[PDB]
Amino acid sequence: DNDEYSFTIYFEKIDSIMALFKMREKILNTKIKGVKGIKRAIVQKKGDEYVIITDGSNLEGIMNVTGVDINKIQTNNIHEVEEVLGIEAARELISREI
């Protein structure tokens, strides 16, 4: 530890000018929360209920998320729902999208 909101890693094992920047970039690319694929989520009010509009698409991950109505989720991706739900669901989604 160094400060209230600042620390330092010492990497005493590695002895190379190369791969130190690689470790830095690997650290900078580490996920801390959220599900993969989603960029940002926005809460909106449609009627008397609250919905979430998402700039990413990850159907299975959202189905795994607690507090999500699995039987009413709708997505913009047709191949995802085709692989997850089936071919008739993909047909209906194509009709609705057009």
**Which residues of this chain interact with another protein, rule CB under 8 A?**
17-18, 21-22, 25, 60, 63, 70-72, 74, 81, 84-89, 92-93
Give me the least distance between CB of 37 and another protein, in Å please.
17
**Sequence-separated (6 or more) residues with CB below 8 Å from residue 54:** 38, 39, 40, 41, 42, 62
Give me the least distance between CB of 31 and another protein, in Å please.
18
Could you give the CA distance from residue 62 to residue 34 in angstroms, rounded to a whole number? 10
> CB-wise, 41 or 87, nearer to another protein?
87
Query: Which residues, listed in sequence order, are joined to residue 6 by a DSSP beta bridge?
Result: 3
